[PDB]
Amino acid sequence: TYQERADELVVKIKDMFNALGDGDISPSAYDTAWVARLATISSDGSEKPRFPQALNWVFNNQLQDGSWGIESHFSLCDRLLNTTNSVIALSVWKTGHSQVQQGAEFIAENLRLLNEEDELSPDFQIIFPALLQKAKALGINLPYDLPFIKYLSTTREARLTDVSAAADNIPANMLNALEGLEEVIDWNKIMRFQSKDGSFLSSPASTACVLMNTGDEKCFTFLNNLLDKFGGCVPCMYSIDLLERLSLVDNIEHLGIGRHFKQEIKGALDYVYRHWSERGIGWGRDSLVPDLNTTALGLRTLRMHGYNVSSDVLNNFKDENGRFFSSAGQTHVELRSVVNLFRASDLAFPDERAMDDARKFAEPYLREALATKISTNTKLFKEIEYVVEYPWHMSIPRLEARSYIDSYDDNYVWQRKTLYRMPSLSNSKCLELAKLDFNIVQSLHQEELKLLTRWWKESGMADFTRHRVAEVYFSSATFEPEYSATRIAFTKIGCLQVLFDDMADIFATLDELKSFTEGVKRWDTSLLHEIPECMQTCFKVWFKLMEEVNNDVVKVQGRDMLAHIRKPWELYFNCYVQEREWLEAGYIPTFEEYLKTYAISVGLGPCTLQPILLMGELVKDDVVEKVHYPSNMFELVSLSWRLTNDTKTYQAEKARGQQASGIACYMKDNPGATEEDAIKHICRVVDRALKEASFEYFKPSNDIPMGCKSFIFNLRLCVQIFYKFIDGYGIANEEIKDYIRKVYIDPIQV
Ligand SMILES: CC(C)=CCC/C(C)=C/CC/C(C)=C/CC/C(C)=C(\F)COP(=O)(O)OP(=O)(O)O
Ligand SMILES: [Mg+2]
Ligand SMILES: [Mg+2]
Ligand SMILES: [Mg+2]
């Protein structure tokens, strides 16, 4: 069954957490081959392998065709690098004679395929042509004459003279291809780029290379220690204790299964944070040079979990043009590191220039990548497209999880200088759990919808089907199974409010409206007679619901909360009549005056107080105002709701007779301003409001219940996603109607 498989999945993924160390990463033929060339000189002048095991590994790990690398994952450049080097390793100690000839065949055959646009992995035209230089010297028989290989070697020899013309020698940004530049490297100065673990850029190949040219001890102890840990081979990079912890947590959170691993996540992040610094961070704790991807993931993930971290760390990757690079040790920019840069900028607090600068670079780079570089039908295209099309402040949790489940690759191989695997980060158990769990929870949601559609039918509110209740439901955002009573009360209150609003700005007369809110202020049915039949029915459905919800509230909260609960309702209806009082007077308020009334009339208060009081967390009398109205985070969300709503609905409301709006009031305050000027200013206000709410949300708090705070905060999402795709002609390009099937109706093939 599903629940059983998910439970055993949770168990195993918890093991994975508890086992986290320096990193799970695959051996590297290329890197281990280099380690194997290292020579010790016996007293009898005869040279033998310094690291017997590393040669033994290359000996026993020839694939089939017969190259070295990753069987299930073939790649031209990767196979060429791995096999050639492996061949050179065997040849040097003249052994593995069969694999040599066997692999020499694989190379010769495939060399005639490097032509010519089959994109080359980073620094291929430097580390490979160097492998072929040593191939000649050993007499290995290969087609060195191909017009293409002669071009790669040409560019390399041209790149060598550049280092000769460097008073400071090899630039820091070519350190990646260290071992493809031996003949122009100053071996004293190069050492200035050694990490505290003896390694160069965490690369075993590079570290072997400097070991061979210098006999440096630290280089040796890094390699020796690594081989002993990997049982006689080496990965393409190590350690990766920082990257692995961050990606694991991010991937799980992103897959929608973060709630099952709260304690294990806290342990992983605590570890990372102890190694956090204003300088940025690299793959592992011992990196000399930080990298953008790990730092960007660190920023976002750490901030997301309540850690105090500064966006200034990003500037360590920014140049004069405001452009970012992946790492001072290389020339190429990694697409992934730019995705993570953008995603980190999603969590910007107000006045964080670095976040602004990151997003101004990353976004166009990302859209550029989508247009030219990435193939459409791919998981990756689908992943990056969601990142830019539904950024954080409009990313609905379930929709975000459903979409990432489809783009998460559990059979992925990363490409640095060669291909490697990180089993914790590309993990089939994570993916399976994510799907099983999504289904499990989806069934719960179906049942809630059923209950909700039933209510809409029986309540007589028939006089907008489930399709209108489903959109409110969808908008609840807070999806965890424990919060069912909260989501249901929210949806009912929300559905009623859409009704109350149509009543307040369309159907009711000022008098009918006033009478209604008097009925609310009295909290009884004494004034039912003063209002038409249709509004009598609304009031009664509403009032009946209040009794039912309020009884449930006593159960969760442990005592009467009626006095707290009446306040948001009164404030909300009083603001409604105030809207109408202005309209009757023909008065257009100032932008500020306008917000005072409309920032409340938008209705964040009533749809949140009763529901948060049902989540389970105790809300003390003096805390109500700290988490609900008028706390800052609450105001800010209310503001984003109001203003964003204005931009997409002011045109249709003005044709219906309404006057006041964010657009009209701004234009009245600012002579000469057009509607376009108003919208532009408004969106800047909304943008800043979202960022300040994040700052308020993540701020340390002693007495504000986190669940309750989270439910308010994640209500900002629904408004942003709803109106984002209305194209200013009024045409809704994307509609909530379409996410409903994906999130609530279609299960995930298991
Ligand atoms: C946006 C909708 C309808 C659903 C998604 C968001 C959601 C579930 C909100 C639930 C809370 C509710 C009902 C709030 C009140 C309902 C609101 C302000 C609307 F329906 C917005 O439409 P409007 O432009 O006519 O509003 P207004 O300018 O007249 O004030
Ligand atoms: Mg309206
Ligand atoms: Mg209204
Ligand atoms: Mg409106």
UniProtKB/Swiss-Prot annotation:
Keyword Lyase part of the UniProt annotation: yes
Entry EC number(s): 4.2.3.17
UniProt motif (DDXXD motif) ranges: 501-505
Cofactor: binding comment: Binds 3 Mg(2+) ions per subunit.
Binding residues annotated for Mg(2+) 1, in chain numbering: D501, D505
Binding site for Mg(2+) 2: D501, D505
Gene Ontology biological process terms, A to Z: paclitaxel biosynthetic process
Protein's name in the database: Taxadiene synthase
Gene name tied to this protein: TDC1
